């Protein structure tokens, strides 16, 4: 389970206060877990407990919303990306986070025609 | 740099990912896991016991500050609250621990299964 | 077609009248109704289970 | 493709059996009321539970005997269970899936039929069908929200949040639409304070991984950081904090090695009086003056006066 502090909980004031997409499959995935023990002590029917235990295989959706069963839905019924799907696209983190970081130190200004200067040499 | 040289890479284990996660401590007792969902309170800000933003077992938040509270200035380096799980540092080893849902049923990963080759 | 609704004798030969199926259906079609109007390609592959 | 369906598929067959067997069951609800709550009357005399088949009963019972009361009895409160599991749709369809899962707002509820067997009531005068209900919904609800927003929720709060203005809204009578405004809190005997921190507290976190909006290059929260140190206060502190101490050479070193930080400084921040009172000179005096004196050795302006543009 990936630590805490990166998957963060985020902070507009407000009460629009964000969390995140993977606690909530975790949400899930502990949930289905516990109450699910919970049963197997009272050991009542398996229509509760051996259905669930497929709820409970269901944490492949926190795996992946999206191989296997239909995903589950997001804000916008939209494939809470799931943890397998941070480093995944090419707009996924991966490559896009280290091989193509954006990075500091640097200017973006638009670039007027001006050959007054010489070439070897750029106008700042 | 150095310090690092290559890297091998195999199918991961529970009992061997039962290598990390627990942090047993001079409570003399062991700590690893989560068990029931949660962030933090909504009154207080902060994460609770279990607590999927845990601020013991994971650690501090406001940096060096034990749960159990009575815990500031920061010099300690192995402080474990007396009566809290916090043992604290900076607020950075928070970011390197993990924990685990614990299966209560052997569940098996997606990435073999339906896997497009299907290795399982 | 025709066996799920109208299933009026041989309607399709009052609707279609020209080359319906080369005029007269085909082998694999048989068109039964009696149990498909209102209860085939709608349990007998359709949703299934019950 | 689905286990929604497999509800279905194989359990909406299943029927209620009528309500004859209620007593036939009856006579099981109780005989494992029974087996059990000697079973565990005896834990609780002594052994904390033998573990032992005989005490399943105070009264004697062979062993394979009483083995049928049990597991008879069993499928007694397990088939009725079974039976029971079809009305439940109508919680989950008034409950859609409460912010969580149609299943997860059934199986909760399936937390209740159980938690109806038990203490649903033989020899009552009608079926649970008036109290199995109850608990199901007493059962789902109390779960739905304790489920369901990453956050908790005290009830009293995630209830004032669907009544402070519930209530308005039909109080809203004698006023216009939306009640007066903070006699709403008077209405309910509340401080407006505690109010907005109600009102706060209520709707959802965003996505934080949305689009950022019509287009891409877009996840929301590819968004915030709160803190590293803002290079700049990083390359300051050090500085400050290190010059602190290293433009602490305007004195002899009795007092520039020892009080330099106060009593902690860089420290935790600690280490104190007494201590110096004897860590350093057998003081205990001496720790005040030698220190004033150093802490005069820096302040009429000139005494290390290459830090004034300081003014912290």
Known sequence: ?124 | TNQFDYVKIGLASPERIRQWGERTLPNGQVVGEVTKPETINYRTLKPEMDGLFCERIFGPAKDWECHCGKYKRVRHRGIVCERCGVEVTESRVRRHRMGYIKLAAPVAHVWYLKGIPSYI | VLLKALGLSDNEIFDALRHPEYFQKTIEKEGQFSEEEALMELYRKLRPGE | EDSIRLYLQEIGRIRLLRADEEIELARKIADLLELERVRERLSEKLERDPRDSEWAEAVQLPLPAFRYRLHIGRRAKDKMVQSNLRLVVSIAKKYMNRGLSFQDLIQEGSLGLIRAAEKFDHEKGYKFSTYATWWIRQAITRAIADQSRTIRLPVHLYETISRIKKTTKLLSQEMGRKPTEEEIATRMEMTIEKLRFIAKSAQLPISLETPIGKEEDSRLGDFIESDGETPEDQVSKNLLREDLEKVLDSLSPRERDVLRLRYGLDDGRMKTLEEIGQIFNVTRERIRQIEAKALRKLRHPNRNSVLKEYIR
């Open chain 1, 1 to 124: 389970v990936i630590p805490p502090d990166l998957r963060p909980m985020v902070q507009l004031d407000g009460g629009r206060f964000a969390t995140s997409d993977l606690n909530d499959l975790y949400r899930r995935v502990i949930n289905r877990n516990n109450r699910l023990a919970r049963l197997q002590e009272i050991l009542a029917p398996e229509i509760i407990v051996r259905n669930e235990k497929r709820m409970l295989q269901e944490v492949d959706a926190l795996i992946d919303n999206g191989r296997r069963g239909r995903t589950v839905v997001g804000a916008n019924n939209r494939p809470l990306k799931s943890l397998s799907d941070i480093i995944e696209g090419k707009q996924g983190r991966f490559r896009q986070n280290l091989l193509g970081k954006r990075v500091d130190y640097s200017g973006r200004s638009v670039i007027v025609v001006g050959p007054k200067l010489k070439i070897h040499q750029c106008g700042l």
